[PDB]
Amino acid sequence: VRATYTVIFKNASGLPNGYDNWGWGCTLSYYGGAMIINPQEGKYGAVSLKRNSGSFRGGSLRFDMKNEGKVKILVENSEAAEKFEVETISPSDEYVTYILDVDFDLPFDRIDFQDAPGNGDRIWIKNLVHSTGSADDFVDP
């Protein structure tokens, strides 16, 4: 039942080791351990964390987020040039923990957090972890 838990981002102030930002339409900054996305109005901006070597398969994504507007979570396979919409998350003025199943049928090497409405609403992310297992089985490590 045991999963493998990949800690991508926790209490950092820069990009994760082995990840690039393939984002668009935004400024990325940090404060107090949170990644802060400042999207430009009209650009539908996003951070896109690109894993430089290897890929994840299925499993689940866990993260804390607060967000002024609706945020779309996607994964992508850069080799196939395919993207997959995981969930759109409603606004919250406080951090909330999300644990989302990833049902994409390909491996993924990009994880995206996008300003879905394109109004420039800011996004804060902490504590980003992938599990090889399901969201229902995720034991938050």
Ligand X SMILES: OC[C@H]1O[C@@H](O[C@H]2[C@H](O)[C@H](O)[C@H](O[C@H]3[C@H](O)[C@H](O)[C@H](O[C@H]4[C@H](O)[C@H](O)[C@H](O[C@H]5[C@H](O)[C@H](O)[C@H](O)O[C@@H]5CO)O[C@@H]4CO)O[C@@H]3CO)O[C@@H]2CO)[C@@H](O)[C@@H](O)[C@@H]1O
Query: Is residue 72 close enough to count as binding ligand X by CB under 6 A?
Result: yes
The answer to whether residues 45 and 56 touch, using CB atoms and an 8 Å cutoff, is no
The answer to whether residues 19 and 51 touch, using CB atoms and an 8 Å cutoff, is yes
The one among 116, 125, 128, 129 contacting ligand X by CB under 6 A: 116
**Phi and psi at residue 40, to the nearest 5°:** -85, 135
Given the rule CB under 6 A, which of 7-15, 28-36, 71-79, 94-102 is the region that contacts ligand X? Answer: 71-79
Among 90, 6, 122, smallest CA distance to 53 is for 6
Sketch the per residue contact string, 16 through 55, with ligand X: x for CB under 6 A, - otherwise.
Answer: ------x-x-------------------x-x-x-------
The answer to whether residues 131 and 66 touch, using CB atoms and an 8 Å cutoff, is no
Which residues of the chain form contacts with ligand X (CB under 6 A)? 22, 24, 44, 46, 48, 72, 74, 76, 81, 83, 112, 114, 116
